[PDB]
Structure formats: structure tokens, C-alpha cells
């Protein structure tokens, strides 16, 4: 299937999973299309910031759902 | 409508208390730079520096130990504390040591303890905003202001004078 992801700069861009694909799995999704770390990554959705052990199943991600990309700033 | 502009800014609250924003702008259009210190503290500096009265570079230690204070109130709260992965008192030791760096994490919890907004403007290396993220309920105007560069670094902001 295909979810959104809006990026912490405000692009919005497309992945493709399966709803049993880890919170992780996505991260890493999202570092091969877009070249994001996973260890600044902040999946949110619902309100939430999801859990890297978790499925897209666990949190009722369906088709075409859209999730936000929050980023952890160090300096 | 010089500061129309920044009062109309659009913030997507994302998660309770957190807030992003997309505009597209010049930092230094609309903002003075405050240059901080390139020692590992300049997160605690940038927030002296908008903070307290005749800050200096010593002053960044009293927000380190604000910071402690924050902590232990909200740490163990705080969804963004789960990239930490450390006990609450393991990252105190590590938050306190010297020259650690700070981050949104020590953002979120300064403005709850301070009770006041924290914005922090990431630029790409043009110093063009690629996004805010505001920690607090508060408007620009009213915010510590803080710019994030090169992915490393924080300095303060201040609203330039017109659109004050």
C-alpha cells in the first residue's frame, strides 16, 4: 500500500508498506527516498509520536493515511 | 503587516504543545542574529542570551541547572526523551556535563519549567527557514527565538525593531 509522510519542511511525499512494516522499517523507508537519519526521525500521527517496535497495523494506519515528520535538533 | 506577516504565521500543532511551521523567508529579514560562543554550549548560551539580564559567558549555567530542574519534572514525559534512550538519571549526569550539546528535547521541557515559548528556526547553510518548531502556546512575538544552522549549531534571535 502507499501512506504520506509531510516532511518537517513541509513536503509532502509518498512510501510504500505493508501494514505489518515496523515504525523502524518506515524510518528507514524515509531514509532512502528522502536521505533523513532515522536517529533524527520523529514519526507522528494521531497525535502520537509512534514507537519504533510497533506495526502500521498496531496504530491503524490505513491506506493513504498521512504521517508527520518531526525532527530531533541537536547542536 | 511587516509584523502582520510573522503574527499570521501558520502552525500545525502536531503533537500537545508542539508546533510546525513551513514559512519561507531570509532569517536575517526579519530577525537579528545573535552569534553565540562555538564551544559545546551554545544552546544554553542562545537562551541565556534572550533570558537574563547582562548575560555573559558564564550565564549558560544557570539554564544547565534549569534545565536539571526540568528534567525531573517532565523527562520521563516527554515523547522525544524516547530517542534519548537513557534513565532519567543517566541523562542528567550526561546533560550536565560540560560542553554537551543541547537540543529540542532540553527545548521542550525549558519552556514548560519557564513557562514560556521556545521557537527554534532550522536554516539551511543560505540562512533560508526551512521550518519552526515551536514548543508552547505562545506567537513569535513572545518567544525565546532560537536558529539552528549547519545542523550543529544555535544562536539567538531577536525580532528586528520595525516589526516589533
Same mark, same amino acid.
Given at each position: 500500500?502507499?501512506?504520506?509522510?509531510?516532511?518537517?519542511?513541509?513536503? /509532502?511525499? /509518498?512510501?510504500?508498506?505493508?501494514?505489518?512494516? /515496523?515504525?523502524?522499517?518506515?524510518?528507514? %523507508?524515509?531514509?532512502?527516498?528522502?536521505?533523513i537519519?532515522?536517529?533524527?526521525?520523529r514519526?507522528?500521527?494521531?497525535? %502520537?509520536?509512534?514507537?519504533?517496535?510497533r /506495526?502500521?497495523?498496531?496504530?491503524?494506519?490505513? %491506506?493513504?493515511?498521512?504521517?508527520?515528520?518531526?525532527?530531533?535538533?541537536?547542536? | 503587516?511587516?509584523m502582520?506577516?510573522?503574527?499570521?504565521?501558520?502552525?500545525?500543532?502536531?503533537?500537545?504543545?508542539?508546533?510546525?511551521?513551513?514559512?519561507?523567508?531570509?532569517?536575517?529579514? #526579519?530577525?537579528?542574529?545573535?552569534?553565540?560562543?562555538?564551544?559545546?554550549?551554545?544552546?544554553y548560551?542562545?537562551? *541565556?542570551?534572550?533570558?537574563?539580564?547582562?548575560?555573559?559567558?558564564?550565564?549558560?549555567h544557570?539554564?544547565?541547572?534549569?534545565?536539571?530542574? +526540568?528534567?525531573?519534572?517532565? #523527562?520521563?514525559?516527554?515523547?522525544? *526523551?524516547?530517542?534519548?534512550?537513557?534513565?532519567?538519571?543517566? #541523562?542528567?549526569?550526561?546533560?550536565?556535563?560540560?560542553?554537551?550539546?543541547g537540543?529540542?528535547?532540553?527545548?521542550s521541557?525549558?519552556?514548560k519549567?519557564?513557562?514560556?515559548?521556545?521557537?527554534?528556526?532550522?536554516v539551511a547553510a543560505?540562512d533560508?527557514?526551512? +521550518?519552526?518548531?515551536?514548543? !508552547?502556546? !505562545?506567537?513569535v512575538?513572545?518567544?525565546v527565538?532560537?536558529?539552528?544552522?549547519?545542523?550543529?549549531?544555535?544562536? +539567538?534571535?531577536?525580532?528586528?525593531?520595525?516589526?516589533?
Open positions: 500500500m502507499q501512506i504520506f509522510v509531510k516532511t518537517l519542511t513541509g513536503k /509532502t511525499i /509518498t512510501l510504500e508498506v505493508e501494514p505489518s512494516d /515496523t515504525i523502524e522499517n518506515v524510518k528507514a %523507508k524515509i531514509q532512502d527516498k528522502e536521505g537519519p532515522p536517529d533524527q526521525q514519526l507522528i500521527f494521531a497525535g %502520537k509520536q509512534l514507537e519504533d517496535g /506495526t502500521l497495523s498496531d496504530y491503524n494506519i490505513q %491506506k493513504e493515511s498521512t504521517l508527520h515528520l518531526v525532527l530531533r535538533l541537536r547542536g | 503587516p511587516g502582520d506577516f510573522l503574527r499570521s504565521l501558520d502552525w500545525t500543532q502536531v503533537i500537545a504543545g508542539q508546533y510546525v511551521s513551513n514559512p519561507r523567508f531570509n532569517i536575517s529579514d #526579519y530577525f537579528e542574529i545573535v552569534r553565540q560562543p562555538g564551544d559545546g554550549n551554545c544552546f548560551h542562545s537562551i *541565556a542570551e534572550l533570558t537574563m539580564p547582562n548575560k555573559t559567558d558564564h550565564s549558560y544557570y539554564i544547565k541547572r534549569l534545565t536539571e530542574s +526540568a528534567a525531573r519534572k517532565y #523527562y520521563q514525559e516527554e515523547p522525544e *526523551a524516547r530517542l534519548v534512550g537513557l534513565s532519567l538519571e543517566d #541523562y542528567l549526569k550526561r546533560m550536565l556535563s560540560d560542553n554537551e550539546w537540543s529540542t528535547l532540553e527545548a521541557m525549558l519552556a519549567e519557564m513557562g514560556i515559548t521556545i521557537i527554534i528556526w532550522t543560505s533560508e527557514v526551512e +521550518a519552526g518548531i515551536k514548543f !508552547g502556546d !505562545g506567537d512575538f513572545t518567544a527565538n532560537l536558529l539552528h544552522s549547519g545542523q550543529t549549531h544555535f544562536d +539567538a534571535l531577536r525580532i528586528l525593531p520595525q516589526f516589533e
